[PDB]
Amino acid sequence: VVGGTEAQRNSWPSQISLQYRSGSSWAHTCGGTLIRQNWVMTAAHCVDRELTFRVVVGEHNLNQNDGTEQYVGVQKIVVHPYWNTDDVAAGYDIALLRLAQSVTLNSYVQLGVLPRAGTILANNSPCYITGWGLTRTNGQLAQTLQQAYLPTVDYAICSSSSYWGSTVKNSMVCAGGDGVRSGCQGDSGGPLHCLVNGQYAVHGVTSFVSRLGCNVTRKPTVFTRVSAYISWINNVIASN
């Protein structure tokens, strides 16, 4: 997250860190959202590599003992069947991870609430992106979980030629674009949390930014629109 602030450690208890095994250690690669005690929602592109993955719930500082973490292996990966790694602009950037154990819930570890199917946010709706991703374009991962205020940019604006044009689909949510605040590498797969009727819900899965950089004016961060995938999510969890 470029232009973020440090999250309070109990603000976003559905946020997870998706890590892969790297020699004798683990490396953060992506975010995700805990949606069942044994299921995480992330981006498909975060799991294209043939890596060994784990999920960390109750994580705040990637580099220090928080006293709240639970570490759990990924047992099964179900990528959306229409995903194509060489066409992120087509959409379908979503995957579900079944965890090897069910995590224990507490003020640091909660299920993310998803919107009702078909819900579309008014332009300029209040949302936060969260994650441990780069804090500058071509920078480094954050140590502590970051949040940035990223209001939505509706499809009509986002798909206009000075924004994303044809690259954005109605199956996506755009947010931000102010040139200061954005998602960045390492945020992918994590949530966009939007305040609706007094409660935050996870409306987006972080998918892409411009090839020119993270915080580029009129290139809002692009997310998979969770509310387009409710039936898919429910069907995968029911069949696995």
Ligand SMILES: [Ca+2]
């Ligand atoms: Ca930690």
